[PDB]
């Protein structure tokens, strides 16, 4: 509550000096620059509409000088008039500048000119003469055939493009590259007007035989934006071609995942899974190129955070959609996993692909004990003819959710004489790049903590300070997460979980971290169908109440 006039009064002169440049957008440059600035033009028009709406017309002369010329320039420009609600807003602006009882000559002239310009948007025959004459002859209003006219205009151009497409290197009429670029420029502003969407999908499939791209990326980015905000729903073949010809669109869309796990829906993995399955990523990641690009952005995020549980979770989900999409659309002719997963043994992947839905609850300890063996072979015996290093075999181990998480929950079940292999496995997960020295230290710390915890479980339901003792470094997240597993698993929990939660919630980061832990765990159980309903309800309750505290 300060400026009100000033920023808009500056941007006014900017836009009026810009509209005069464009001037009915009959040329290439006027169109491309209109295509860009239109949206900010729309927001300008929102602020402008608020200002003109709250106040009244013919009375005030605030920006009334050349508002008329702005709205003329606007409306006779059709790329303006085509955008979401810019028309609707221009209508509203004009309805603000109308007068009920015009008093001086000027007000009546104004209002007539206002009806004129509305009639020019809506109901003007700026179209081929013979069709006007013929229709007027048949006694039709534009209103009652425009739709079918448009529909026929589109199906024509879409057909044309499909024959351009099929006549690849044939002595026959080659649709003019200029004209294809022309159409593409016109797809942008009315992408969310349903009577083009066949045209679009024809443009994206029908690439043709050029070394050069023909389409201008303002096309690709208009389309990308509209896919992600769900204003378009093409078929999936459309959007694999989109990705596979404009890299910054496929960046722009895997980054629009990242906003979803960061801001909106932190640890609502149902919501994240549903966004990934509705986005077409899985099916488009069946093409090995797009898999490799996507997992590069995943790798860049694994490093910015040093192994953030929230990105680990999104990988686990995404990979599960991808793996189900591979299986599905890979009968004949599929690319071999050293193609998607090139920087590891294909051996290791082929183990880690086998899901725990298809193995019994009892034989999972065996599976993990096999994984520990082959990972230790790859990491400790880091010789020629292998993975490049330990980090790579870890970034693989992430891409399987299930296996990395289940280790703690299986250690508690075998806490009496813990297997050394599991201690290796878990230590590796919470810490790569340590030296054998540091892994053995971590393992024996966890072994002592297993002793204390098994004593505490075989005892009655005890305090929270006894756990705070062992809680009191490089191995903290390991112990925290293992401890929470203990709370949820043992029936000695459901009583003293809150009692440890309150203390362990030093910061908000710990709170969010454990919440992510618990969401991952619920998603994991409800998938794998393994449950004690106590633990399920307890996790839900705790998660519900702690998401309010933050």
């Amino acid at each position: 509550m300060a400026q009100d006039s000033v920023d808009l009064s500056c941007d006014y002169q900017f836009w009026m000096q810009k509209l005069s440049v464009w001037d009915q957008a009959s040329t290439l440059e006027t169109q491309q620059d209109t295509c860009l600035h239109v949206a900010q033009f729309q927001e300008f028009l929102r602020k402008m509409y608020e200002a003109l709406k709250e106040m009244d017309s013919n009375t005030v002369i605030e920006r009334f000088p050349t508002i008329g010329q702005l709205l003329a320039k606007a409306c006779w420009n059709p790329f303006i008039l085509a955008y979401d609600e810019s028309q609707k807003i221009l209508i509203w602006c004009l309805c603000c500048l109308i007068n009920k009882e015009p008093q001086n000559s000027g007000q009546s002239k104004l209002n007539s000119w206002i009806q004129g310009v509305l009639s020019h948007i809506l109901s003007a025959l700026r179209f081929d003469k013979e069709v006007a004459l013929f229709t007027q002859g048949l006694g039709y209003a534009p209103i009652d055939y425009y739709p079918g006219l448009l529909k026929n205009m589109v199906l024509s151009l879409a057909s044309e493009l499909r024959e351009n497409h099929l006549n690849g290197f044939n002595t026959q009429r080659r649709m003019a590259p200029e004209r294809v670029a022309s159409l593409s420029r016109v797809c942008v502003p009315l992408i969310t007007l349903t009577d083009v969407d066949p045209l679009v999908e024809a443009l994206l499939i029908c690439h043709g035989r050029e070394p050069q791209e023909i389409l201008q990326p303002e096309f690709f980015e208009a389309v990308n934006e509209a896919i992600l905000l769900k204003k378009i729903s093409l078929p999936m073949s459309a959007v694999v071609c989109l990705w596979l010809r404009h890299l910054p669109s496929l960046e722009k869309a895997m980054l629009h995942l990242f906003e979803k796990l960061i801001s909106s829906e932190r640890n609502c993995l149902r919501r994240i899974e549903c966004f990934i399955k509705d986005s077409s990523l899985p099916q488009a990641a069946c093409h090995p190129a797009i898999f490799r690009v996507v997992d590069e952005m995943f790798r860049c995020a694994l490093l910015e955070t040093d192994g953030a549980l929230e990105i680990i979770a999104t990988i686990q989900v995404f990979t599960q959609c991808f793996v189900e999409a591979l299986e599905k659309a890979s009968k004949q002719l599929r690319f071999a996993l050293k193609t998607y997963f090139p920087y590891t043994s294909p051996s290791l992947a082929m183990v880690l692909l086998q899901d725990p839905q298809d193995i019994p609850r009892g034989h999972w300890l065996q599976t993990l004990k096999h994984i520990s063996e082959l990972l230790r072979e790859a990491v400790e015996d880091q010789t020629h003819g292998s993975c490049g290093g330990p980090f790579e075999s870890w970034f693989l181990f992430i891409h399987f959710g299930g296996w990395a998480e289940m280790v703690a929950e299986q250690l508690l079940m075998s806490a009496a004489e813990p297997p050394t292999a599991l201690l290796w496995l878990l230590a590796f997960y919470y810490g790569p790049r340590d030296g054998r020295q540091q892994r053995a230290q971590t393992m024996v710390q966890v072994k002592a903590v297993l002793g204390h915890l098994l004593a505490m479980s075989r005892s009655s339901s005890l305090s929270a300070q006894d756990l705070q003792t062992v809680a009191g470094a490089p191995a903290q997240q390991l112990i925290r997460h293992l401890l929470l597993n203990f709370l949820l698993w043992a029936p000695g929990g459901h009583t003293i979980a809150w009692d440890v939660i309150t203390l362990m919630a030093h910061t908000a980061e710990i709170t969010h971290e454990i919440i992510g832990f618990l969401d991952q765990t619920l998603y994991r159980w409800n998938r794998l169908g393994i449950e004690s309903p106590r633990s399920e309800k307890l996790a839900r309750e705790l998660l519900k109440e702690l998401r309010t505290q933050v």
Binding site: Q87, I121, L122, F134, N152
Partner: protein, 340 residues
């Protein structure tokens, strides 16, 4: 059911007088009454619009109203064109009342605020009048922009958008009058032919004979119309390009022997000069050797059920005019030769 008659005819009166320049007395009351009547009609379109005798009864009322008016004498009024124009009758009225210059000031203010309430009702399940006008304006721009950026006049008129479209407009309007059976379609088409631009019209009919059937009654009416009027068919066959009329023939064997008749008689009214080794006509309006060659050219590069026909019509006109085996002599010898 009979309740709807007095409602719809009254609204049809108001719609026709929407365009008319008497507007001094009209007010918010007239406007609000109009739009709520139109909502009632649009609501019926939704409720009991399909599979009803009331449906067919309203179309009887429409067509008999649209034929007592005709498009002749008192007003060439478009009118609401069909039962689907029920679904956007409000829109017609509203668009036309903007176009009405005589619209009084305060009525226009109440009007425009009743049509364009604002984003105060942004949340609506029902496609309201503001959103309806939206989609229109968008499409209108949409069609300008495509026409002027990537539209091309297809050679093969049958596959042009506009010819295809205008054809299918005509065929809706013919099917209505066919079922109505009040006047013969012959009368309608003859009057069309006289009233509007002929060059456009012919091309369209042409394109209409080729669209596959949609509900071939349409094509079966127009062929009988054309055989009924030879004189228009003389300008039809003269005005178009060759391939169009050729695929016309392989579709309708009923036009073949008359069309070959037309040129057969156009061939015979030339004369060959020895100075320029070329057939030519006497008058300015006599078809060239090249346009005639063209048309028979196309008819030969066609299906077998026309090839034999054209071949034998030329052989029988060769024998008739001396069975010479040299040029200078028979237009028809010239052709047969020119083909190899």
């Amino acid at each position: 059911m009979e309740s709807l008659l007095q409602h719809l005819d009254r609204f049809s009166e108001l719609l026709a007088v929407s365009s008319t320049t008497y507007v001094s007395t009209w007010d918010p009351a007239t406007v609000r009454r109009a739009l709520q009547w139109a909502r009632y009609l649009r609501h019926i379109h939704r409720r009991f619009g399909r599979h009803g005798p009331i449906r067919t009864a309203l179309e009887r009322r429409l067509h008999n109203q649209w034929r007592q008016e005709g498009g002749f004498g008192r007003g060439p009024v478009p009118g609401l064109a069909n039962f689907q124009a029920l679904g956007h009758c409000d829109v017609l009225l509203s668009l036309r009342l903007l176009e009405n210059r005589a619209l009084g000031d305060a009525a226009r203010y109440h009007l425009v605020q009743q049509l364009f309430p604002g984003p105060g009702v942004r949340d609506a399940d029902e496609e309201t009048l503001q959103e309806s006008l939206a989609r229109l304006a968008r499409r209108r721009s949409a069609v300008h922009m495509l026409r002027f950026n990537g539209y091309r006049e297809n050679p093969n008129l049958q596959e042009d958008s506009l010819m295809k479209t205008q054809a299918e407009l005509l065929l809706e309007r013919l099917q209505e009058v066919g079922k109505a059976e009040a006047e013969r379609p012959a009368r309608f088409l003859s009057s069309l032919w006289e009233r509007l631009p002929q060059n456009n019209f012919l091309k369209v009919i042409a394109v209409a004979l080729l669209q596959p059937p949609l509900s071939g009654e349409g094509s079966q009416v127009l062929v009988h119309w054309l055989l009924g009027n030879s004189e228009v068919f003389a300008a039809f066959c003269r005005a178009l390009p060759a391939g169009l009329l050729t695929l016309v023939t392989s579709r309708h064997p009923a036009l073949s022997p008359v069309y070959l008749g037309l040129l057969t008689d156009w061939g015979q009214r030339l004369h060959y000069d020895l100075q320029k080794g070329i057939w030519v006509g006497t008058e300015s309006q006599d078809v060239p050797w090249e346009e005639l060659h063209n048309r028979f050219q196309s008819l030969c590069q066609a299906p077998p059920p026309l090839k034999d026909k054209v071949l034998t019509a030329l052989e029988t006109c060769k024998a008739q005019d001396g069975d010479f085996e040299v040029p200078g002599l028979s237009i028809w010898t010239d052709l047969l030769l020119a083909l190899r």
